[PDB]
Design a protein around this ligand. Structure first.
Ligand code: A6Z
Ligand code: CL
Ligand code: CL
Ligand code: CL
Ligand code: CL
Ligand code: MN
Length: 340
């Protein structure tokens, strides 16, 4: 039977089922006030699927100049054409190769660039913004979005949205690498999975994905969602409460010193965006500092709500197109205030 919502993370994560239900705010606002992330499923069913395909981005925008990142070693591939990324998104025999002769796991950096999404892709901009869940929070002029209403005593988010495009991580060694390293944002955000590409040709990485989910600490109901085999999994997230950010900084200063890094006692390993918490580090955070997080598998059409100040990291299981919008809820406005 259709239902309004369910729970993941053993009851610690709200999952809303109908992205356009006018009563979602009643269930959402209690969890949100407590500093929890929230998941909303089904947004892909609201969108024009032909606007969110890799082949369309390559056809329309392929001659633009861009930089890529090699996810395995953080090397920058400078000043290549955006088609060199898009044409290898699903077809492994078309990917740029490292020296070792393997196909690379690449991230497309800052594309569309800065605040240019709306000007470059007006039809994509309209399709996303008209279908975002919790619209009183997430639309540029929603009644519960303070972004347009705050003085300069508050850090205001840039004009969005922002697209996040990267290949899936493949090997056993890749399990310890991030697509996006551990960081935090002073604004709230909603991140929507608009396309998942599951490859062919050398796309025999389905088996190692079914060991990542597990070691990633995903709950039994999420696992039930993986093992049912009805929906496409895109990315594994770990999110931590804003209140636990300093304890995470303490762990990462201890680990940096153990690994012979030479850092001042006050430096900020979360702002540096240089760490990915692997299974070893997540267990050390729990055992040594008493910190628990949320392990979230984002499927096609899932919207992840990330609270302001909450440290978070992202690991792509398959090739993903994500689109994110920043907003400033009244519940979390303290995180962007410039004093005390
Ligand atoms: N729409 C659709 C059909 N989908 C094909 C891909 N399926 C898949 C493939 C690899 C891993 C996991 Cl968990 C799921 C899900 C069903
Ligand atoms: Cl908070
Ligand atoms: Cl467009
Ligand atoms: Cl709303
Ligand atoms: Cl990163
Ligand atoms: Mn972020």
């Amino acid at each position: 039977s259709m239902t309004s919502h369910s729970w993941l993370c053993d009851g610690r994560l709200l999952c809303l089922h109908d992205p356009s239900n006018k009563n979602n705010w009643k269930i959402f606002r209690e969890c949100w006030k407590q500093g929890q992330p929230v998941l909303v499923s089904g947004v892909h069913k609201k969108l024009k699927s032909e606007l969110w395909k890799p082949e369309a981005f390559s056809q329309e925008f392929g001659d633009q100049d861009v930089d890529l990142v090699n996810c395995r070693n953080c090397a920058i591939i400078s000043d290549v054409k955006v088609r060199d990324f898009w044409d290898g998104f699903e077809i492994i025999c078309k990917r740029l190769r490292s020296e070792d002769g393997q196909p690379m796991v690449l991230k497309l950096k800052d594309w569309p660039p800065g605040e240019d999404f709306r000007d470059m892709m007006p039809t994509r901009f309209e399709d996303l913004m008209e279908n975002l869940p919790l619209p009183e929070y997430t639309k540029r002029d929603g009644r519960l979005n303070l972004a347009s209403r705050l003085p300069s005593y508050f850090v205001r988010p840039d004009l969005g949205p922002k697209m996040y495009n990267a290949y899936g991580l493949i090997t056993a060694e890749d399990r310890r690498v991030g697509t996006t390293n551990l960081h935090l944002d002073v604004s709230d955000a909603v991140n929507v999975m608009v396309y998942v590409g599951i490859p062919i040709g050398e796309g025999a990485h389905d088996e190692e994905v079914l060991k990542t989910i597990d070691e990633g600490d995903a709950d039994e109901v999420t696992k039930e969602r993986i093992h049912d085999h009805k929906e496409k999994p895109g990315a594994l997230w770990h999110i931590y409460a804003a209140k636990d950010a300093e304890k995470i900084r303490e762990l990462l200063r201890k680990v940096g010193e153990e690994q012979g890094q030479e850092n001042p006692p006050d430096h900020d390993p979360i702002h540096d965006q240089s760490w990915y918490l692997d299974q070893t580090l997540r267990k050390r955070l729990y055992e040594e500092y008493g910190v628990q997080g949320w392990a979230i598998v984002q499927f096609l059409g899932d919207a992840v709500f990330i609270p302001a100040g909450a440290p978070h990291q992202v690991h792509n299981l398959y090739s993903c197109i994500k689109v994110a919008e920043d907003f400033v809820s009244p519940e979390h406005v303290k995180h962007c205030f410039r004093l005390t």
